[PDB]
Symmetry: D2
Subunit: 362 residues, 4 copies
Amino acid sequence: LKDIIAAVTPCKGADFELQALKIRQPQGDEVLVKVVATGMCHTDLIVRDQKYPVPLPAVLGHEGSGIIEAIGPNVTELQVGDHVVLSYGYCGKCTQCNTGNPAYCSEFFGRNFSGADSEGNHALCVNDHFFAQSSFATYALSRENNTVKVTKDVPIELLGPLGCGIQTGAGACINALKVTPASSFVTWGAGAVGLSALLAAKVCGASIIIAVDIVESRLELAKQLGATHVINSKTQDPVAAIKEITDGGVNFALESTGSPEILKQGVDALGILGKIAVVGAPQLGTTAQFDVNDLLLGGKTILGVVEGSGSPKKFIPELVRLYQQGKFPFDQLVKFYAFDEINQAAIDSRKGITLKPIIKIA
Amino acid sequence: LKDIIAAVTPCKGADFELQALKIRQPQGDEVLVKVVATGMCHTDLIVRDQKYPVPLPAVLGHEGSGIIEAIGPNVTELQVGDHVVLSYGYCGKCTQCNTGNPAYCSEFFGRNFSGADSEGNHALCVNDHFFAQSSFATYALSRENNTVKVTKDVPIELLGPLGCGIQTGAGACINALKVTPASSFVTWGAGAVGLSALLAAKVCGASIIIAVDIVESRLELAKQLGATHVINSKTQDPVAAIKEITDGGVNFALESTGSPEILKQGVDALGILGKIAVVGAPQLGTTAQFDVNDLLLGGKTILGVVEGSGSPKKFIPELVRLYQQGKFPFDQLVKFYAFDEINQAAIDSRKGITLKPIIKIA
Amino acid sequence: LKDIIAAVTPCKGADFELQALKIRQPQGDEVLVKVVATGMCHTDLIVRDQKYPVPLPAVLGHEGSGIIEAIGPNVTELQVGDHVVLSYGYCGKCTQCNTGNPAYCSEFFGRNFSGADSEGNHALCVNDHFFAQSSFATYALSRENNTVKVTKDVPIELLGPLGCGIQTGAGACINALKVTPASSFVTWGAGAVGLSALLAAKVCGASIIIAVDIVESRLELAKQLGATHVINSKTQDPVAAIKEITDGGVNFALESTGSPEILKQGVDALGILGKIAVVGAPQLGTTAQFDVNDLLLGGKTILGVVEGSGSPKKFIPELVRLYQQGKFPFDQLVKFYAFDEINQAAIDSRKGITLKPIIKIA
Amino acid sequence: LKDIIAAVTPCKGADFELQALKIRQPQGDEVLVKVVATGMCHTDLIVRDQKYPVPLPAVLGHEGSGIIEAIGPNVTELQVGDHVVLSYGYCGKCTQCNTGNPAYCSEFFGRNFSGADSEGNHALCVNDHFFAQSSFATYALSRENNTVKVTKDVPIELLGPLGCGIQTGAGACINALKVTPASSFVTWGAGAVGLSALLAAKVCGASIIIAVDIVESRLELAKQLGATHVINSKTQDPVAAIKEITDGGVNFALESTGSPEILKQGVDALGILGKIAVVGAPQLGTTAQFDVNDLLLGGKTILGVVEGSGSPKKFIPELVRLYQQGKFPFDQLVKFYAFDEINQAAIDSRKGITLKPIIKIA
Ligand SMILES: NC(=O)c1ccc[n+]([C@@H]2O[C@H](COP(=O)([O-])OP(=O)(O)OC[C@H]3O[C@@H](n4cnc5c(N)ncnc54)[C@H](O)[C@@H]3O)[C@@H](O)[C@H]2O)c1
Ligand SMILES: NC(=O)c1ccc[n+]([C@@H]2O[C@H](COP(=O)([O-])OP(=O)(O)OC[C@H]3O[C@@H](n4cnc5c(N)ncnc54)[C@H](O)[C@@H]3O)[C@@H](O)[C@H]2O)c1
Ligand SMILES: NC(=O)c1ccc[n+]([C@@H]2O[C@H](COP(=O)([O-])OP(=O)(O)OC[C@H]3O[C@@H](n4cnc5c(N)ncnc54)[C@H](O)[C@@H]3O)[C@@H](O)[C@H]2O)c1
Ligand SMILES: NC(=O)c1ccc[n+]([C@@H]2O[C@H](COP(=O)([O-])OP(=O)(O)OC[C@H]3O[C@@H](n4cnc5c(N)ncnc54)[C@H](O)[C@@H]3O)[C@@H](O)[C@H]2O)c1
Ligand SMILES: [Zn+2]
Ligand SMILES: [Zn+2]
Ligand SMILES: [Zn+2]
Ligand SMILES: [Zn+2]
Ligand SMILES: [Zn+2]
Ligand SMILES: [Zn+2]
Ligand SMILES: [Zn+2]
Ligand SMILES: [Zn+2]
């Protein structure tokens, strides 16, 4: 086995602290990865604060990128030295995995959120296997189906975030909603998820692209990214503004705040036959409201989306190619921090000055 | 012009009373119909009680069938003597009508619910043009696009209800949801709309077909129509029953009670990637709730449906053909009343002994 | 009635000649248009040469734009003075028109190709009603459903071609094929139809955009319009080139030459699960070949497309909006000629120096 | 290792002969199956006659059913004693396998047709691994992803054929074409594949169900299975008959003869917007013809289909459930033979008296 450094979250709300640990060699179709850098997402934070019961203590991080250092014996599609992006955790044998919907895997809450493996064994010597990677560390063990080979022609430290927040936002528009050329789209919330979606609606051809938030600097960045219209929902009624701008209501929408009352607003601002995709979440158990009659008479659709609905092994490489061509500049949401500044990376994202932090590890 | 007898609804909640009135000859693409019989629907009742502002006084009825007596000059697809079913009111020139979605016509609330025509002119000499027919009368004026030619080989008095409640229920399953072979389906509410949907899921191939209600005799009829499972939601927790029966949650569902708290139940009982279509309505302005997280993690879809989403000129004849073949026995929901018993037809549907009344007029 | 000048095609292969004729006022839902300019298409030429039996003599032209001068009495969506684009001819009452497929109207060969109206009456005083417009004239009579209102903010002489060749090419990609973001597309033939499709695949997000032709200047223009790759099929094996460029075969394709042997090439160059749309036509009765096994084992799709499959009343305005935004520069295929140079406009398109001619009439 | 009996095909066209061989224990995610019975398909025959280059000598059979006798160590979804159906061979890691299209796996010709494994190793001690099973033997080795658990409540000897011919025919209608309620369908060729499709169109709700063949007894069985119309294409022009019966052309079709000239007939008999799925194959390299203009003006679709396009792990159990309910009586195509009568089973299928043979082995 091997010794490594990893950031541990010791208890409800505790700060990340660096600790010395050990990781074993890979078996079956497992992969041993040398981590270069790992993105930081809202979800790592909500788990520390236990608004989700991942058992503590544990090693979090779910947006890793690195270099393969060792493959197991049944590994056939990856070799030592490949550059990879580590995405969420799926079984690939159930009904949803066999029909091209891994995000809906009947083992989704157990492979990413349990805190362990299939038996209760941990691969780190302390709970691990978080989103099947536990990547706030120098070394990570993943599975072949969640390890995505990417090109060596792009700096590898910048691509971790594609395994979660960027695919989630871009995917909601491309795979789930399917925005069409010449249509109107709006993103509720202008964080890294929303702005990823805004960049993808640009790629789909939409003619009207709107962003709604409460922090002014996030609204200025949206506009610089190509939002045709920006709206401050603290100072303006957003429903009324969206309806006048789109002459009746928007064709496509994204809810990324997780706020219930903003979510009703989002269903109300849809036009006839409009669709709203739901990616943000409130506390376990919260409900939201919608006006019945307005949804039934408008023929409106309300739909739930996990990780953008695609197949990551297919979609992740498509986003890297769109970026190399100059059509999807997600590198503009990023700011790099040192490993010993990981607690400061959390703070900046919560106050809104940093859209997408990336913990440099190697 | 011509003299006729029609049932008038004089004020909030008043009883239908027979009155002598006059109807003019048809113009442009209008059609003059001799009514044989007209179905009765919940919606005629909710308009009398003004939970919807159709201006009173007026002639209601929106499920008519009859014989063409006179066509206007630009009428090209119908001739004197054809047997017809009079469906809802659409413009056929807007964006939704031109793309095959007439139920979503941008003039839907004005052609059926205004109480008049495009200018304010009434064709009956008193508000008319209700669902573009006003068919509780011996004579009705409709438009060519809402007048559907059907075969003379089936008694014409039995087909009126296809212009609304039967198409609504059958259409939600066939056109909107699209139930697939070997799947699980549930109808919340076992009235004429629900039982029409249940009969259509049988046609689509579903292997598990469930019906939930509170009146026992409606649950016995469902089962005799081929429900694999029936559930009384006064005596049993319906969510728990649906989840155990379908091993995790139903693939497809229909909400036809209009009750908000039953509607949350319906979203909760869906399985992974399930879909629930909404056709029943509460009072103008009411909202309903759903659990966020459960909808987002299950990839659930919630969708609004008006009149089954098809094109009636295409779908209505398809239902008559399925019926003649013996595959869609909607005649089992019907009971005939005389024109002078129209007030009693309302009472029986509200207490649940009569599923679908048909006022015989000729 | 009114006197006008129109170009007549007197016999198999005869030259257009200007003649003095008369046009009547509009009835029912008919529209009287003052023509500003009319595009020229390959199809006008093939009808003169009678590879299609439109009865001669007659007034052709099927890509008109103008100003409304008079509306009939049942016209409700257009007024005197609107600027319009005159598209093909559809009934709007049959099964295909009622489901959002007017291009497939069961009266398609009779409304555009018969040479007359529903009865045999001609509106021009000599066969007319060609594509329901006969627009190589100072005045044209159309129907409300084929007359598309557009903005007064764009010169009206440039938009006629949107009623046929530009919608055909752009529509095959947007409505029929549905090209997806990051995919590979190829257009066989780089004339106005192909290059319209190439511009639309740019709008849909495709990462690889290929054009194949035999005239070098058309290949240079494609590349300047944003083709990633161009291929001369006289000098290079195009199948082999397309397969190496897309690492196995293209995802989406368009056949616009009408040449059978090029069409087999097009099915062979598709990759697994690829799709090829057919818009070009050979002589009535010609067949084409495909390799069976390759289509069955690759899961390939071969599909027929008329006028881009959309709804023109919806799609035409979407293209004008994409153009105003700077995302669909179809004005680069155009060259203007005087009315008395109409015979020279035919010659230039047949030799390939002119992509899309526009006969200026007003 | 273990000793067994298996039928070997020694050379171009040789007869099956029983031989004594040996099979090894399973590794990784491999499965050791005790075979009860194996269906016989046209494809076993075409490989013996080498119209496809599977290297001889080898053990064929590709429609097996049996009992699990041993699982490898990474096997998680199957246990010793389960009853299974062995379907075709897929990788489950490529782009097509990850998006829910295993039939289109980029390793399809190598996993079923190579004659060996990934390296050239054979598991039988002589070429094996045929359709990843080689099931004309008492023991078979398969992979976990091609081994489908089914219920112990149905005799296991009857279900092998579901791993190929029955799924192919039923799947073309349910997954690939998607026949809709009240539509018209036709199957060209009334063998086990066609009649499986005919039984599935019954399940999808079609109102008109046609079967075309040249052997009279196969046409009598179709009709007894519920074909509304039967046609002998030796004695009647089938195009003309199909067009008059469906008033213009059929909505959906299946080509299962592999005959090119019958395949053009099939595209000609489609009605506006019709679709024809291609499952039968001619010799490697053969082409077929279609009329261009008729396909382009009708908006017709021609599509290639392998093994019914579904996901077998999902679809196979759906067919067994439809059968138990009494809605898909595929047991009527079957006749059982002894293992030592396997050469006679080939003869009877080629002369058409036996629709689907099943070699009883245990
Ligand atoms: N469903 C999935 O697969 C999935 C995966 C990724 C992220 N998540 C969730 O998606 C969300 C977005 O993540 P992110 O990285 O973009 O977070 P973020 O903090 O970067 O972005 C959210 C934005 O919402 C804005 N906001 C908050 N309250 C608001 C209000 N009342 N009105 C307007 N704007 C408001 C904030 O200003 C912020 O810019 C979080 O809920 C995250 O946990 C879901
Ligand atoms: N969206 C549309 O196009 C459209 C058109 C038709 C009907 N409507 C609406 O659809 C509904 C159905 O019409 P219908 O003719 O079938 O009415 P109905 O009265 O015949 O049927 C509704 C059924 O709901 C049941 N129900 C009521 N409360 C219940 C509860 N708490 N739990 C269980 N069951 C309960 C009743 O027992 C009854 O059988 C009405 O709301 C009607 O106005 C909508
Ligand atoms: N289906 C419909 O609705 C519809 C409507 C519009 C146009 N049409 C047909 O579509 C076609 C395209 O019209 P267009 O205006 O673009 O015509 P065009 O003459 O401008 O373009 C066709 C191109 O094909 C190229 N070509 C011809 N033979 C070739 C070969 N062997 N190899 C490579 N390239 C070759 C020519 O160089 C030319 O550039 C014509 O057949 C027209 O009649 C169909
Ligand atoms: N694409 C796939 O995944 C796949 C898998 C299974 C079967 N196959 C192929 O599908 C086909 C069907 O297999 P099957 O078991 O049903 O074979 P079969 O022999 O049982 O059936 C084919 C039928 O075609 C009929 N036929 C032959 N020539 C005819 C003609 N000219 N006119 C009319 N009828 C004619 C025969 O009478 C026979 O009944 C074969 O080509 C087989 O190899 C394809
Ligand atoms: Zn899974
Ligand atoms: Zn995340
Ligand atoms: Zn309308
Ligand atoms: Zn009604
Ligand atoms: Zn039509
Ligand atoms: Zn044209
Ligand atoms: Zn594969
Ligand atoms: Zn087979």
